[PDB]
Amino acid sequence: MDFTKPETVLNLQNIRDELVRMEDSIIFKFIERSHFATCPSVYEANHPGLEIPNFKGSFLDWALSNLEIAHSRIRRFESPDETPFFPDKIQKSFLPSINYPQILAPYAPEVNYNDKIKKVYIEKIIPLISKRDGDDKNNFGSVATRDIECLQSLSRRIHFGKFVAEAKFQSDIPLYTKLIKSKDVEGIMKNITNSAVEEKILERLTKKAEVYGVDPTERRIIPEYLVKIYKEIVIPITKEVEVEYLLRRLEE
Amino acid sequence: MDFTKPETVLNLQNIRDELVRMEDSIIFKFIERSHFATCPSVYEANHPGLEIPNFKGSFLDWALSNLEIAHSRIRRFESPDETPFFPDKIQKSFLPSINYPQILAPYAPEVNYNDKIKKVYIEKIIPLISKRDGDDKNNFGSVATRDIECLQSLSRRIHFGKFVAEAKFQSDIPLYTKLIKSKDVEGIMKNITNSAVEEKILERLTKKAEVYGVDPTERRIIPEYLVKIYKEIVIPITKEVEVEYLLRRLEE
Ligand SMILES: N[C@@H](Cc1c[nH]c2ccccc12)C(=O)O
Ligand SMILES: N[C@@H](Cc1c[nH]c2ccccc12)C(=O)O
Numbered sequence: 001m002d003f004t005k006p007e008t009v010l011n012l013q014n015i016r017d018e019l020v021r022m023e024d025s026i027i028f029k030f031i032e033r034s035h036f037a038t039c040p041s042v043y044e045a046n047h048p049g050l051e052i053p054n055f056k057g058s059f060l061d062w063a064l065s066n067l068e069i070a071h072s073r074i075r076r077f078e079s080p081d082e083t084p085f086f087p088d089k090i091q092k093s094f095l096p097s098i099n100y101p102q103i104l105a106p107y108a109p110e111v112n113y114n115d116k117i118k119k120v121y122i123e124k125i126i127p128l129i130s131k132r133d134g135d136d137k138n139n140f141g142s143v144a145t146r147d148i149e150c151l152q153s154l155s156r157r158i159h160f161g162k163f164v165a166e167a168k169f170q171s172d173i174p175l176y177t178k179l180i181k182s183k184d185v186e187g188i189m190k191n192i193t194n195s196a197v198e199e200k201i202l203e204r205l206t207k208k209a210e211v212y213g214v215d216p217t218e219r220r221i222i223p224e225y226l227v228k229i230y231k232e233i234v235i236p237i238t239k240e241v242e243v244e245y246l247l248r249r250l251e252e
Numbered sequence: 253m254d255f256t257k258p259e260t261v262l263n264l265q266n267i268r269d270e271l272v273r274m275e276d277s278i279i280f281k282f283i284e285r286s287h288f289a290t291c292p293s294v295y296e297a298n299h300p301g302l303e304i305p306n307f308k309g310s311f312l313d314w315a316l317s318n319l320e321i322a323h324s325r326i327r328r329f330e331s332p333d334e335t336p337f338f339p340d341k342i343q344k345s346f347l348p349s350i351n352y353p354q355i356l357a358p359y360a361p362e363v364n365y366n367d368k369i370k371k372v373y374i375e376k377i378i379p380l381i382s383k384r385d386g387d388d389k390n391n392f393g394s395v396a397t398r399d400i401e402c403l404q405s406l407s408r409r410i411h412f413g414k415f416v417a418e419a420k421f422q423s424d425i426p427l428y429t430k431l432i433k434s435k436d437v438e439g440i441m442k443n444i445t446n447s448a449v450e451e452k453i454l455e456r457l458t459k460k461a462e463v464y465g466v467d468p469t470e471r472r473i474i475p476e477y478l479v480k481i482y483k484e485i486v487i488p489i490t491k492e493v494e495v496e497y498l499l500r501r502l503e504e
Binding site: 021024032035049053063066076079095096098138140149204207210213215216 | 273314397459469
């Protein structure tokens with residue numbers, strides 16, 4: 001995949017490879033986050049102790065928004081595969097731009113489910129992957145920086161669905177043009193879903209959950225929980241991105 | 253290991269478990285960096301296309317130096333296990349300070365091999381883990397961020413020598429005080445060298461390298477290379493840390 005050669009990107013064999021690459025990535029990031037307690041205070045807005053000056057919002061938000069502003073100056077968000085968490089906070093780059101071709105439809109950057117991703121990460125994911133409940137006062141920084149790594153991988157994996165959608169669109173213009181014009185979300189859903197491919201994915205994740213992080217010489221991740229996160233969070237939100245992208249495909 | 257309870261830190265068994273957890277983190281991060289080319293320009297100071305406003309140094313240095321300043325404001329370098337690449341840039345934290353009791357000698361912060369770590373990583377590690385030689389101008393930022401992750405992990409595992417050296421100095425004060433007095437570098441070296449354990453680590457590394465990153469149902473990391481990195485880079489620079497620390501123990 002070369003984001004300057006449209007044809008390597010809109011290649012489904014390639015898209016598949018990247019998603020695989022991305023799942024191992026997410027797993028590694030989950031295993032690192034698993035070494036700390038849940039640290040409820042890292043996520044509370046304006047927590048009594050972790051009180052950031054001139055700042056409403058959480059300790060995580062501060063660390064994340066700040067990372068984004070730095071990265072944005074170094075062209076982080078010009079790339080079609082990178083979606084910001086604080087879109088309103090990011091700056092313009094001070095580096096010469098890379099003239100990315102127009103691969104996805106021009107409204108692509110508006111399809112942004114990051115608010116929802118940060119929310120379920122905090123509410124449904126931290127609980128299943130953290131070491132124990134409660135604050136670990138000496139590791140709030142270790143925790144937030146790990147949270148950002150997890151959030152950014154999930155966000156890309158999930159937003160990758162825009163690429164997946166376009167690739168599916170090109171392969172059967174007639175089918176998707178019918179569905180899109182008639183706003184048949186159920187038809188789009190039914191079509192972009194492959195129950196046999198998902199089954200395989202969930203199987204792969206269980207075995208990867210079983211061999212990763214564990215010294216080959218007990219389990220940093222609970223297989224059931226990793227499968228649960230994919231089945232209930234990652235896969236479903238990716239389809240939400242896909243159908244939203246498609247319904248606006250033939251707009252202007 | 254709680255850096256506010258001295259008795260937990262100077263526990264050889266606790267130290268050994270920490271280092272073993274760091275192995276996995278280093279491996280995971282090598283796998284991540286491995287997806288990209290060598291990107292020589294990221295490491296080149298003031299490179300034509302990667303010219304940053306009001307800054308001398310590489311793309312890597314800007315990204316790293318900015319991360320540390322940010323993290324220092326939120327107490328990152330108050331922790332004894334964190335050593336910065338840019339000591340003269342970090343600032344005081346704006347959050348209430350955690351009172352870490354003195355555990356290592358007062359001069360511990362002065363033992364900082366981060367420069368050597370950055371050079372060997374660039375010159376000897378990158379060529380061994382990268383996908384291919386050459387610049388990939390669409391991934392300089394993605395590359396710089398994977399590098400930081402690698403460096404911060406390498407830096408923490410290597411400077412943990414400081415803690416290893418002390419727990420040992422306590423464990424056998426008459427001997428080490430003897431060696432330190434007559435500056436028996438070879439003796440401290442031999443005394444700190446735990447041979448039969450080194451073979452074990454290397455066997456564990458080979459096995460982990462063989463299992464992580466690969467779909468359990470490809471070898472992202474070459475085991476022989478991981479063994480070479482630890483055998484010639486990590487384990488040896490850790491010892492130079494231990495040694496420099498010990499030679500200045502009674503220097504007060
Ligand atoms: N891959 C793109 C976008 C990107 C990802 N992470 C980044 C961090 C900094 C700057 C850019 C990026 C690049 O390397 O430019
Ligand atoms: N573990 C310490 C120091 C630390 C490690 N990584 C950090 C990143 C940001 C801030 C602090 C840290 C803490 O969380 O406070």
